[PDB]
DNA sequence: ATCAATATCCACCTGCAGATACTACCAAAAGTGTATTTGGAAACTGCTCCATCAAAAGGCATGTTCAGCTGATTCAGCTGAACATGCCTTTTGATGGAGCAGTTTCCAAATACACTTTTGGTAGTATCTGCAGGTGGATATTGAT
DNA sequence: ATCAATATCCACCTGCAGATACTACCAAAAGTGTATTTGGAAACTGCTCCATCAAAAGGCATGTTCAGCTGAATCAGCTGAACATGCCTTTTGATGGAGCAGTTTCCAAATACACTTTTGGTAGTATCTGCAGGTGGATATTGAT
C-alpha cells in the first residue's frame, strides 16, 4: 500500500499542464454558461461554434495568467497556498477594480 | 509588360494589397508611393523573425510542422517579441514551463 | 439532480487552470472566488460581443463579435480572425 | 461563395526562405494572420496619428518609419527600419 | 533566409524567475 | 523636550500631502534630469517650459500611484514598511515588467 | 560659442525627502532605506520611455524644441494620458 | 495670433446652467477641454471601427450610439443615449 | 433666418465644429447628419455631469471657482466617472485622502 | 542503505485527419494618360526659451538616539492533498431549418460647390474680485507621568 | 486623568493674480440652398452551419486519513523615525540675445482619378503524409523500511 505525499502529484500536474495546450474546462458546461450570461443581453441568440471557442480560449488564458499573478502574491506573503486575498490583490493592482 | 510592385521591391508580401488596405482604412486622404513598400517590408521582416524562432522551437520538439505552441514558445522566450505581444493571447499556445523555486520539494 | 450553470465550472477544472499557472496549494475558498471572476470576465466580453451583433442586425454572435470585444477589453486574441 | 482574403500565401513563402523543410498548421497560420493584421493596424494607426499631428494629408515612408520606431522594441525597430529602407531603395531603383 | 534577422535574442528577466 | 513616537509624524505627513496638489519634486533638479535624459537621446534639444511641467505632473502621478500599489504589497505581506521587493511585485502585476 | 555645461548625476537631485513626500501622498507610513535608489531607477526608466517617444515626435516634426504636445502624445501612447496641457 | 480654437465657451455655458454662481480656473478649463477632446476621439474611433467592421463608409447617429454603449459605463451610457436620441429626433423634427 | 444646428437641436455644444472635426479626423469617408448632433449632445451631457459634481466639491471646500482638485474629487468619488477616466491623470488634481486601516495607531 | 510501486522515457508502428498540391475563373493590381493637391525652398517675423546673476527662504544633509518593526523560532490545530470507486455528465456523431450573406435595385441622404452670414477668437483695455498667504488666538492632539 | 508641548483650526485682512467682461472686429467657418452622387436598407432565396437530440465514454462527486502548512505567540536585534543643527541650492524676478517655431507664397513633383489590360490569389477539388495515438520494455523517481 503506497501513497504519494502532499504536493508531489501537484508538481506533476504543474509539469503536465504547463506542457499541454488543451482547454481545461469541459466544453458543454461553458457553452451553457455563455448562453446563460448572453440571454441577459439579447434573447433567442445563436453562437458560431468558433465564437464559443474564441471565448473559452480567451477566458482560460485570462484565468491562467491571474493564477500566475495570484501565485506571486501568495509567495510574496511567504505562503505556497493561493487564497481569495491573493486573487483580490492581483486584480486590484492589475486595475480590474478598487 | 506587367511587374508586381512587390517583385520590384524584393518582397513576398503584397505591396499592392497593403496599399489598398491603407486606402480602404481611412488612415489619411493620400498615401505616398513608398509607405506600402515600407509597411509590407516591416510585416515580412517581423513574420520572418517569428517563423525563424518558431522553426527553431518546432525543431527541438522533433517536429517539422510549426503549431500554435511553437509560435508561443518563440514569442514568450524573446524579450522584444514578448513585449510587442504583451497584451496578446495565442490561442492553443499554452504557457512557458515555470515553477517558482520555493514550490520545489526539499529532498 | 439540477444545479447552476456556473457550478458547471468544477473544482477539478479550476484546479487544472491553477496548475497551468504554476500553483502548488489551493484554499477551498478559491473555487467560489474564481467562479466570481470568470462570471465578470464573460459578462464584460459577451456584453461587448452582443453589442456588435445587435449593431450588425444579426441574431447570431460571430467569432469576430468576440474577437472585436476581446480587443477593446485589452485581451486581443489571435487565430479566430481579424 | 465570395473571396475571403488572407496573408497565408505570403506567410508560407517567408516560412520556406527561413525553414525550407518546415510546415505550419491551419491553427498556427491563423495566428500569423491575426499577427500581421494587428501590427498592420498598430503601425497604420500611429502613422495616421503622426500625419494628423503635423497637419498632413499624406502617410509617406516617413510616417511608417516613425510609427515603427514608437511601436517596435529596441532591436526589432532597428532591423525593421533597415528591411524597410532596403525594400524602398530596391523599388526606387526599378525601371 | 535572405532577411536581416537579429543576431542575438535575449530572454525576458521574469520576476521570481 | 517631548518626542512624537515613530509613526505619528508619518501619519501627519500622509494627511498633509493627501490634502494638497503641489508638486513634491523641486522644479530645477527635475528640469536638469529631463535635460540630461533628452540630451543622451538627442543633442541641441530645447523644451517649452510646459513640456517639462507636463513630464513632472506625469512622473509624480505615476510615482504616487506606484507607492499606493507598493504599500498594498507590503501590507499583503503583513508589514507596514515598503521595500524594493514591494515596488517590483507591483510593477510585475501592473505588467510594466516580466 | 558657450557650449552647454556637462549634465551628469542629475537623478541624485530626486532627494530622499522628495521621495518620502511622494510615498506620503501614496499613503506610505514606513520606508526601507533601499527604497530611494529603487525609486530613482523606476523614475529614470519612466522618464527615458516618455522622453524617447516625445523626442521621436519632435524629430519627425523636424523641430529642435520639445513641445507640451510632444509630451502629451508620448504619455497617451504610453497609456498615461494627461489632462491640462492641450490635446 | 493664429486662431487656436477650444470648447471653453460651451463648457462655461453649461457650467452656468448647473451652478449659476460658480466659476472655473483656466487650469480647470484646461482639464475640461482635454476631457471633451478625449471622449470625442474615443467615440469617433469606436464609431470609425464599427463602420469598418460592417463594410460601411458612413458614421451615422447609429454608429455614435453603439460607440457610446461600448465606451461609457451603465448609467452614463443610459443618460448619454437619451440626450443624444432627444437632440437628434428634435434636430430632424426642426426642419 | 440663419439658425445654427446647435439651436435646431437644443444644445450649447457646437454641432458645426463637431461635424468638421469628424470630417478632418478621417474616421470615415462620409458623415451622417445625425452623427455630429448625437456626439455634441453626449459630449455636452458628460461635461454637465462633471461640472455638477465639481461645482459641489467647490462649494463643499468653501470656494466659488472650480480648480483641478475639484475635478479630481468629483471624478474619483463617482464610481462611473472614475472608470471612464481610470487611465487619465488630472494635472494639479492630487489624490483622495485614504490611509489603510492597519496603518492607524493603537488597539 | 533495500525494495517496490508507479511514473517516465524512448523506439517502433500505422490510419487518417489535416496537410500540400492543382486548376479555371475573376476581383483587384498594374499600366497609361490627364486630373488635382501638396509639401518643401525661400524669406521673413516675433514668440519664447536659454543664459546668467543677485538676494534670501526653505528645504536639504548629517549625526544622535531609541521606539518598535521585522523576521527568526517554535509549535499546535485545521485544512487542503491524496486517493478508490460507479454514476452521472459530457462527448460523439447524425438530421431539420434559422438566418447569414449573396446581390440588385432605386431613393433618401450625403457630397460638391460657391455663394452669404455669423460665430468665436484675440488683442487690447479695463475692470472686478476670489482667494492665497499671512497673522493671532482660541482649541485639539499626543505622549509623559 | 492630569498637564504641557506643539500641532491645527478658523475667522480676519489684505493685495493682487487671475478672472471676468467689455469692446469692436474680422477672419475663418458655419450655414444656405440647389446641382450631383451613391450608399445602404429592402426584399428575395439558397445553402451553411447552428440547434437539437439520442447512443458512446470517461471525468467528477464523494467521504476518509493525516501530512505539513498557516498563523499565533514571543523575542531580540537593529533598522528606520524623529529631530536638532548647519548651511547649500533652489526659488524668484528681473534683463538681453537669438534661435527657431510659425506664416505665407511658387510651384515641380507627387498622388489621385478614370479607363483599360492583365494576372495573382482564391475556391473548389484532389492527392499525400506528419504525427497522435497506440504498444513493449528499460530506468528513474519517490516513499516505505
Ligand atoms: Mg549625457
GROMACS .gro file of N, CA, C and O and ligand atoms in nm, chain F residues 36 39-40, chain G residues 7, ligand 1:
model
   17
  435UNK      N    1   1.929   6.610  -1.914
  435UNK     CA    2   2.029   6.502  -1.922
  435UNK      C    3   1.974   6.392  -2.014
  435UNK      O    4   2.043   6.352  -2.109
  438UNK      N    5   1.908   6.496  -2.379
  438UNK     CA    6   2.043   6.516  -2.437
  438UNK      C    7   2.101   6.382  -2.483
  438UNK      O    8   2.137   6.372  -2.601
  439UNK      N    9   2.106   6.285  -2.391
  439UNK     CA   10   2.152   6.146  -2.413
  439UNK      C   11   2.075   6.080  -2.531
  439UNK      O   12   2.136   5.992  -2.595
  504UNK      N   13   2.602   6.787  -1.804
  504UNK     CA   14   2.494   6.724  -1.725
  504UNK      C   15   2.532   6.580  -1.691
  504UNK      O   16   2.540   6.497  -1.783
 1077LIG    MG1   17   2.485   6.300  -2.106
   0.00000   0.00000   0.00000
